[PDB]
Each structure stands twice: as structure tokens, then as C-alpha cells.
Amino acid sequence: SILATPILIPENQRPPFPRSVGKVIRSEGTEGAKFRLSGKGVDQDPKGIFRINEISGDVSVTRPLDREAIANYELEVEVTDLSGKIIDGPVRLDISVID
Numbered sequence: 254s255i256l257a258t259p260i261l262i263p264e265n266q267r268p269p270f271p272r273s274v275g276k277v278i279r280s281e282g283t284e285g286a287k288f289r290l291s292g293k294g295v296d297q298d299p300k301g302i303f304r305i306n307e308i309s310g311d312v313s314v315t316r317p318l319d320r321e322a323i324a325n326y327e328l329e330v331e332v333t334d335l336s337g338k339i340i341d342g343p344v345r346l347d348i349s350v351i352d
């Protein structure tokens with residue numbers, strides 16, 4: 254299974270970026286496997302705001318967030334084998350921008 258825990262990010266962070274903001278966990282680990290993240294904020298507009306590390310599941314943010322532009326993101330996180338076949342998930346990853 255995959256455990257995605259909602260992430261809260263204070264609005265208008267100072268840099269340096271990227272900044273780690275949370276971590277998704279696969280119960281079996283990732284040996285021979287890759288985390289993959291998608292959604293608005295990742296691969297749909299606005300693109301490139303959030304990333305996940307394929308091995309560690311560390312979720313990062315790449316810039317300051319304006320809560321009055323977008324207050325919440327609802328992402329998909331899944332795990333594939335090395336060839337891109339889904340083997341776990343997707344599950345919903347909530348990211349909320351807080352005051």
C-alpha cells in the first residue's frame with residue numbers, strides 16, 4: 254500500500270527553494286520502484302510547483318505559494334516499477350496552503 258499524508262504549507266515562504274514539505278511512504282519500500290506525482294501543480298497548469306523524489310518519496314515545493322491564488326492542491330501519487338508500470342496507487346495527496 255501507499256500512505257499519503259496531507260501536507261500543510263505556510264503561505265508565502267521565503268527561499269531558498271526547493272523545500273521539502275512532506276513524504277509519501279510505500280509499505281513495501283522502493284526497491285525496483287519509482288514514486289510518480291501528477292496533477293494541477295505538477296504536470297498540469299500550474300506546472301512544476303511540486304515534485305516527488307522517485308526513491309525516497311520526499312515531496313518538495315519549488316516556489317512561494319499564494320493562498321489567495323490557489324489555496325489547495327489535490328495531487329495523485331503512485332508507484333511504478335522501473336519500466337513505468339503502476340504497481341501501487343494512485344492515492345490522493347492533499348496539499349493545503351495555510352495562512
Ligand SMILES: [Zn+2]
Pocket residue numbers: 254255279280281341
Ligand atoms: Zn504496496
Ligand SMILES: [Zn+2]
Pocket residue numbers: 307
Ligand atoms: Zn529519475
